[PDB]
Amino acid sequence: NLPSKMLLVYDLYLSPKLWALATPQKNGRVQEKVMEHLLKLFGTFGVISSVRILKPGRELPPDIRRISSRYSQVGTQECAIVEFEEVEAAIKAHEFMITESQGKENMKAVLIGMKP
Structure with a gap:
């Protein structure tokens, strides 16, 4: 049995396409676009x-307010909470996320799941 397996996100809206291009949708603002x-980008890897x-x-939430506001560096504090089938999936995307988003303040992910 697994004790915890959650992941939190960051710097997804700072993409030149979302903030620089600004694409107004009838469905939902940045919330829908992202x-x-x-x-799809997530379903492919997990x-x-x-x-x-x-x-x-x-x-x-205490999980991000404390951790999210701690790793200030992405030039923007945007948090997202994803729940996949397992960390195995996520670990594959985590690297793919941070590796591609490395050096630049873009889409990122960090494994969140400690003992309360």
Whole structure:
């Protein structure tokens, strides 16, 4: 049995396409653009069971408010909570996420799951 297996996200809206290009949608603002685009990009390496995104100045849970505000560096504090089938999937995307988003303040991910 697994004790914990959750992942939190960052710097997805700072993409030149989302903030620099600004694409207004009838469905949902940055929330829809990022949520949808991430679906396929995430489903390819690992389907998501649920994605709870909390942007700044709104709702910052103890898990992110403490950790998210701690690794200040992505030039923007955007948090997202993903729940996949297992960390195995995520670990494959984590690297792919941080490796491609390395050096630049872009889409990132970190394994979140400690003892309460």
